[PDB]
Amino acid sequence: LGTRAKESLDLRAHLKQVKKEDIEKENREVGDWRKNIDALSGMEGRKKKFEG
Amino acid sequence: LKDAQEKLELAEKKATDAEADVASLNRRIQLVEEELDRAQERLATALQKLE
Numbered sequence A: 001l002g003t004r005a006k007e008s009l010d011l012r013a014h015l016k017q018v019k020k021e022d023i024e025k026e027n028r029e030v031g032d033w034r035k036n037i038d039a040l041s042g043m044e045g046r047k048k049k050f051e052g
Numbered sequence B: 001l002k003d004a005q006e007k008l009e010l011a012e013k014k015a016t017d018a019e020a021d022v023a024s025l026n027r028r029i030q031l032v033e034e035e036l037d038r039a040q041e042r043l044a045t046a047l048q049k050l051e
Helices: A002-025 B001-048
Strands: none
Touching: none
């Protein structure tokens, strides 16, 4: 009984390792970028050129 | 000239009316600047609550 139980335990151990430890390879992607504001400072242009 | 006199008077009156609208547009500019600042602040707090 112990042998059969430990067989399944060891079999699932490696699967759990691969599933979980490999998550630590990267988890910062949740972090978003700046997305800064202007605060009425980027108003320094007239209606001179618009195509470029 | 008399008609040129009336025209210049009317044009200067039009200038003054444009200046009254200049005042009203100044008021719009100021209040909308308050709105801009308030929106910056409220957006900051909303994003923080999101975090």
